[model samples]
Target: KSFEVVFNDPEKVYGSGERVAGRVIVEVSEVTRVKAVRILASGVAKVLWMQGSQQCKQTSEYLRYEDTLLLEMVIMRPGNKYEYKFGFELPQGPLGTSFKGKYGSVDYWVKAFLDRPSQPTQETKKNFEVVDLV
Candidate 1:
């Protein structure tokens, strides 16, 4: 009925130098023309919130990766579920792990965007965890 991201890890937790693998599923209710599936894997420490009605924002990237699937083009039918596989390795030198804070936070996620000709662009994302490393 909609797009879904399925991770290979049951706990959805990863370590440095580990390979993160997943599949993006495209399930449309109607006919769809898909031109590009752009995937971005990113990890960042972010500080974006409100400071007593004042806007506060700052961020730093720890890791990033980009790829595009279906660069050729394709048409989708309701009968079939489209899937694109992706995998990436995290940096091995060790970095800050995933954490949620009040104002700022360290996070990692995989985001996907669908580029459609003569149509609207759609996007989705899923997050994973990185534990502290030695």
Candidate 2:
């Protein structure tokens, strides 16, 4: 009935070129069928503001990653839980630190989705921080 993303490491912060690992947890309260399960990870920088009665916005997505964590899985019993583990080796690039300002922000996140044939997808997200190596 619900999904959750849990990282093996308690802290979500990581330096550039670090290894990231996590698991997708799904709880089924009733009998359910799923077509597939997937995870998406992304890093992006965006800026936007209104200046001089004009709207201005800019965006740059430096990283976009997706993978199928599970497939053709069926929940045979109620009140059961399922989990899938995943890992990624971060690419070397100009990865911006997680920031929040009045006009813009740089962010990184991992999201999980459960796909069903006749129902809307169930999804959840967890945000993380990436800082440059000194």
Candidate 3:
């Protein structure tokens, strides 16, 4: 039992304050019980590197944004695939565009997870690009 995240937009890219939409698809081979399905979107920035001949280390964080929801209520049985749609507005604040440097990165992605009452969770992620308005 696994899941996949799919974005409705073809480009799978966004600018600040843009509307984003996607669907979570879950595939099951046997009858399963679940508590709920959830979707989360987030942006993160991280920096870690060693500087100076003395080997001093430095790190910085600039972004930690997230949007989450309980996308659906699961039933008691399943044999095929299930789909749920979700939509949200991206942060309008100054968010650094997705980038990767020698020792740091800014990234954004959407994830979906299945919550079962007493079993392990099944999840997947779909990454997207964020670029500044040019």
Candidate 4:
């Protein structure tokens, strides 16, 4: 009936050059036909706030990872369970850690989507924290 992006880490914390690995788990109660699985991994930093009368916003992209797992119309029956492995390597260069503030935030996550040709797409995302210390 639903799907989820599962990660091994309890806190889901990561760092620059660190390897991130996870799996997408899908379970359904009814028969389903899947076309493919699309993965989008992104790291972004954003800022937004309202001044006296106007609003201000800005954003930056630090990382991106994209891939797809193809399936030729694989038919799934009830109680079907499907899992796909996914991995991404963060940049080793200067990268900001995940955080939030009153007017801005930096974040990272992996979004996984299930493509069903004749039906609506099922998608999920799992966010992880970035940590870099002096």
Candidate 5:
């Protein structure tokens, strides 16, 4: 099965307030050893909140997206607009990557496998954008 996690708001470059939304999509091709999948939203903690090490929060797992650990979740927020950055990952295989800025956005490709016993499938990373506003 080919698996993918998609977003309704994949690009959020500007705005004092914007809602980030997302979902997961999977298409099986032949057969694969599928494990757990999760959708994640993260941001840097306030300086005062971090005494020493950095703290990252894994907000929630999309239970609706969880089809035998295959999960899809949608996050909606008016605030928390500009804390840090936003993205998602699969606990089984992280095959996608991205980067964003005040006026920049990037999209990459991903590949997954359920074979190796030592590590999960690696991401076939790509840079979608390192753009100029002009």
Candidate 6:
């Protein structure tokens, strides 16, 4: 079976603005073509928070092998109860026609072609808390 990525970091908790660095296990089944790989982070605020905001974007991460991919980077905190989304893609194709769903108001999607058909895959979403850093 051909697999993509396995996040070493799961249900991680950290202070706001704190660095969110970890590793992702990437194993391939057979010889496949990979344009690029990346992580997406999103956030939202329904409760009370000193700082209220959000963020969403495709990280500049790529891998082309049968090994584990590590994602060690600082994630900018948007706000409390932030919903994060992670995914991978081949390449960008068109606009709107790409991506999947919403991740805490922010959409974690990619533009690509599947069998020459311009379409977007389903995006993932998550929620977390943010603590004040001392």
Q: What is the C-alpha RMSD of each candidate to the true structure, in Å?
A: 3.2, 2.6, 3.5, 2.5, 15.0, 16.5
Clashing pairs in 5: 1-28, 1-29, 65-71, 65-72, 66-71, 67-70, 95-110, 106-129, 107-128
Arrange candidates, best TM-score first. 2, 4, 1, 3, 6, 5
**Model 2, stretches more than 4 Å misplaced?**
71-73, 98-104
- Candidate 5 per-residue C-alpha lDDT over 1-134 given as tens digits, one digit per residue, 9 for 90 to 100: 33444445565332212333444444444333433343333321111234469764322221111122233232322322211122333223221121122222223222222222343743222112112222
lDDT per residue (tens digit) for residues 1-134 in model 6: 21132233556544434444433223334333333334554332222223346543443222111222222232222222212224332222221111232331222222211111132332233333333333
**Candidate 4: tens digits of C-alpha lDDT, residues 49-82:** 7899999888777789998854356787776568
lDDT measured at residue 94 in model 5 versus the true structure, 0 to 100: 20
TM-score of 2: 0.86
Residue-level lDDT for 23 in candidate 4: 76
Candidate 5: segments with Cα more than 4 A from true spot: 10-17, 43-119, 122-134
> Each prediction's TM-score against the native?
0.81, 0.86, 0.75, 0.84, 0.30, 0.34
The candidate that wins on TM-score is: 2
lDDT: which candidate is best?
Answer: 1
List where candidate 6 sits over 4 angstroms from the true fold.
Answer: 1-12, 46-128, 132-134
* lDDT scores in order: 0.79, 0.78, 0.68, 0.77, 0.30, 0.30
State the local distance difference test value for candidate 4.
0.77
Worst 10 residues of 5 by lDDT: 124-133
lDDT of 1: 0.79
Candidate 3 minimal-lDDT segment of 10 residues: 57-66
